[PDB]
Amino acid sequence: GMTEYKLVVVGAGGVGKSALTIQLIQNHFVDEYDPTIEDSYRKQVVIDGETCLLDILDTAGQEEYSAMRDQYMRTGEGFLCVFAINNTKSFEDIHHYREQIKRVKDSEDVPMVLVGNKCDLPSRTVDTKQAQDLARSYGIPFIETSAKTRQGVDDAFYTLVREIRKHK
């Protein structure tokens, strides 16, 4: 890719950051839960007619490894802020992750997309209105995803790239 974009995936443990990333990179769903300490990926993709080199920085949800997360966040240009639609604390903690981004980037003006993952599950407990209101409160897009079915995966990452372009 000519244009390189540094994308950071953040959010609470277990919400599906790595499964989303692996669906983007390799079109495969991981059903195991292997907690991340640090993982980075490169993927070339055409987005809006531009050949893009995406650096995907997939971070730990476990706060024990937040020092490593912060090193990845400092290099990133845009952030996928992921919660799971069956974990209300992960949704509430989007505020924590946004505050971390503001702290590490020393800026309140950072490209961000809200992602509500695991939408294939039954008995969803974080409803669409809650999620859209939270995204609205920060002026950011909200994308529903399922890493299992691949629904929304490209839209989530491509929307973040578009947000970075807007910001540039």
């Binding site: 990179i25 390799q26 292997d34 300490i37 640090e38 993982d39 980075s40 990926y41 490169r42 650096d55």
Partner: protein, 77 residues
């Protein structure tokens, strides 16, 4: 807990968990496959703690449990 840090081709990085009975090949297979990397095309080295000696070329059958706490480099052959 029991992990290995691995520097990968194309500026990528992973930290892998080690489970009982894993060779180095087994331990890195997922991380390589997701990134389109075939282990047969790669060299793996154990990075040292001092600069006097040479980084140690590893066999794919090295037991991953013997490498816990180390940093490795995977490079294209």
């Amino acid at each position: 807990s029991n992990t290995i840090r691995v520097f990968l081709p194309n500026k990528q990085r992973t930290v892998v968990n080690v489970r009982n009975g894993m060779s180095l090949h087994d331990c890195l297979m997922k991380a390589l496959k997701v990134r389109g990397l075939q282990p047969e095309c790669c060299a793996v080295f154990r990075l040292l703690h001092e600069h006097k000696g040479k980084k140690a070329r590893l066999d794919w059958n090295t037991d991953a449990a013997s490498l816990i706490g180390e940093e490795l480099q995977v490079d294209f052959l």
